[PDB]
């Protein structure tokens, strides 16, 4: 006996050693160097589209890789595939489970997945030859609700779940290629990388992790956060990433710098960050907040460049076209607002 | 022009079929009453319905469609997912009434109830209360080895409601105790002070009698109070 105690001393103390390695790296700060940067000035978006199609509150969105289409999931069990330009409905899919907490669009547009409290990953094919959109493949390996997912390809796809673990699946076999574990809570948010080498994930342990898609190992654990991590998005180039949290602060972390880059907070905001997303360059950081006002920050200068009026109820989801051509805002008002 | 005109026509029909489907969807959907049933375990949440996934229940009662849901398939970290339901007609909170022993996990029920009651997202949701294990509560209380009075001393001086309903052969402390817990949820009811939602007690395990009459009539009244409240009466 008395082994767990020394385990605690050696374990946490070592943790202190890692902390030492982290803080020694602090030779500069992004804020120090942003003095020289010309800021953005007051620049705001405007409502280019008002999308009235949903009966219930819109809980999540995703862009189609064409920067044209975008996918929306509704709490009513309807999964609607929308068209930005013609503002019509590209497809309408009845869900098996009325509760959908997320959905995503395939890189090729072949498939679209959704998920929620149903504990199952619903894969729908857009290529159905016999007819309209039908259930293509269901992936149920999860011991917890289906929180989120994003496509690596048409075959293998990452999912996150309240089972506290993340999973890399393959549709055809119906099994998981590999399963990633080691967070202490539900994995609430994820963002894949453009190069799909590795992926970040936010969870309820107030820590953002970088895993490796292929290796199956935890590469890095970053803890700067004050509270739970609601939403997280990797930087376009793959070298950095942004974090939304319940801390009521959006925070910027680097993978390669292995420590906190920057903190965005405000003295007047008691409400958490629902969702986050980038700009083309990564100079602008979009943040949706529970106050129903979306602050547009300058991911470098750190001052809010602008704000988004909009939905009268909570902002659920936020997304930017792969080419950064457009911004999309889902809320619980059943209305989608598209901005630029 | 051929592509744009041609898509206006084809996609136009797409829009017509989809939208007409939508109007067919909103009426059937919104006409139903979705309810969130949750309890720790041994809640006889499957018993009330026994007399789509296993969790979801589709039922017809008195020309009123109901959608019950069981969260029994999820882990106990709820703060993330429980926000999914702020339009749900009601949160049914089902607790075993005899759970004061083991530790008094009913005290946990109290705390969780305060939790649901306190969320900004649930401010608009009324909580229908299911006190399960009524008889088991009464008997368990008479057992005495583990005492409520440690965890609820105020029972000695907290007073019987005027409408007292003892069962045949029932020591008055048992009945008043029952309503006493109910009142214990009542001070919680006044904790908000908003008046948007309310706690309606219920009794199960007393007999197998259906809660549907309760469940319905109370739900009916609740949403009626959404209309009334939004109609500036209250």
């Amino acid at each position, epitope marked *: 006996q008395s082994e767990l105690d020394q385990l*605690r001393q050696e374990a946490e103390q070592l*943790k202190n050693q890692i*902390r030492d390695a982290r803080k020694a790296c602090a030779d500069a700060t992004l804020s120090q160097i942003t003095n020289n940067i010309d800021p953005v000035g007051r620049i705001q978006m405007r409502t280019r589209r008002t999308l009235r199609g949903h009966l219930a509150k819109i809980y999540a969105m995703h862009w189609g890789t064409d920067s044209r289409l975008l996918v929306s999931a509704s709490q009513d069990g309807k999964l609607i595939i929308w068209d930005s330009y013609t503002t019509n409905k590209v497809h309408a899919i009845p869900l098996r489970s009325s509760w959908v907490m997320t959905c995503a669009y395939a890189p090729s547009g072949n498939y679209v997945a959704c998920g929620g409290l149903d504990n199952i990953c619903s894969i729908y094919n857009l290529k159905t030859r016999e007819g309209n959109v039908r259930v293509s493949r269901e992936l149920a390996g999860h011991t917890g609700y289906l929180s989120c997912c994003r496509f690596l390809d048409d075959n293998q796809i990452v999912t996150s779940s309240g089972d*506290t673990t993340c999973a890399l699946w393959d549709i055809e076999t119906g099994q998981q290629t590999t399963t990633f574990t080691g967070h*202490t*809570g539900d994995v609430m948010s994820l963002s894949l990388a453009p190069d799909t080498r590795l992926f970040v994930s936010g969870a*309820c*342990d*107030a*820590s953002a992790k970088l895993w490796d898609v292929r290796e199956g190992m935890c590469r890095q654990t970053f*803890t700067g*956060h*004050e*509270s*739970d991590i609601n939403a997280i998005c990797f930087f376009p180039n793959g070298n950095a990433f942004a974090t939304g949290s*319940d*801390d*009521a602060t959006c925070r910027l972390f680097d993978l390669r710098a292995d420590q906190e880059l920057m903190t965005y907070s405000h003295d007047n905001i*008691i409400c*958490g960050i629902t969702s986050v997303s980038f700009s083309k360059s990564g100079r602008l950081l979009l943040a949706g907040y529970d106050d129903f006002n979306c602050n547009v920050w300058d991911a470098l200068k750190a001052d809010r460049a602008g704000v988004l009026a909009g939905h009268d109820n909570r902002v659920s989801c936020l997304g930017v076209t792969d080419d950064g051509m457009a911004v999309a805002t889902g809320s619980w008002d059943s209305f989608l607002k598209i901005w630029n | 022009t051929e592509d744009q005109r041609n898509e206006e026509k084809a996609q136009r029909e797409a829009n017509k079929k989809i939208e007409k489907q939508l109007q067919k969807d909103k009426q059937v959907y919104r006409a139903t009453h979705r309810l969130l049933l949750l309890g720790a375990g041994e809640s006889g949440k499957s018993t009330i319905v026994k007399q789509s996934g296993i969790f979801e229940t589709k039922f017809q009662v008195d020309k009123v469609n109901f959608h019950m849901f069981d969260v029994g398939g999820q*882990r*106990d*970290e*709820r*703060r993330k997912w429980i926000q999914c339901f702020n339009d749900v007609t009601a949160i049914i909170f089902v607790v075993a009434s005899s759970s004061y022993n*083991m*530790t*008094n*996990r009913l*005290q*946990e029920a109290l*705390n969780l109830f*305060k*939790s*649901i*009651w*306190n*969320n*900004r997202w649930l401010r608009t949701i009324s909580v229908i209360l299911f006190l399960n294990k009524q008889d088991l509560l009464a008997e368990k209380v008479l057992a005495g080895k583990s005492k*409520i009075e*440690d*965890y*609820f*001393p105020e029972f000695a001086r907290y007073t019987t409601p005027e409408d007292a309903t003892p069962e045949p052969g029932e020591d008055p402390r048992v009945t008043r105790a029952k309503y006493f817990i109910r009142d214990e949820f009542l001070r919680i009811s006044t904790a908000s002070g908003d008046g948007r939602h309310y706690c309606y007690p219920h009794f199960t395990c007393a007999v197998d009698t259906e809660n549907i009459r309760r469940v319905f009539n109370d739900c009916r009244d609740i949403i009626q109070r959404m209309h009334l409240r939004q109609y500036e009466l209250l």
Partner: nanobody
Amino acid sequence: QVQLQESGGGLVQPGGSLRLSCAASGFTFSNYKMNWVRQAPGKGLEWVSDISQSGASISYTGSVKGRFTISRDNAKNTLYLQMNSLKPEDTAVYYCARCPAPFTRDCFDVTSTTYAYRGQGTQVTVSS
């Protein structure tokens, strides 16, 4: 990181008094509703006592009501449990946990097994 350092605990003969401390860091202790939650030997989690940021809103479990003192030092960002009326039935593993969400009323702690914000905890034992 996010950490809470529990002090105190040990063997105490019933009836004493103790000022328990919890060190907060990795977050602003001022903004979080605090509570002491115990997990009894071979028993599930149970909420024990919570305190508001201001230290005004304060609730206890029925037994510990008024007989136990939860007190927070925000300026020092540390938490306290002063024990009176100690019983061998109160002996348990005491964790000091913070409510997850900032600036709120509800809390989703006392969650069995995994819970984000919690220290290593102490053992508080009341001899017979």
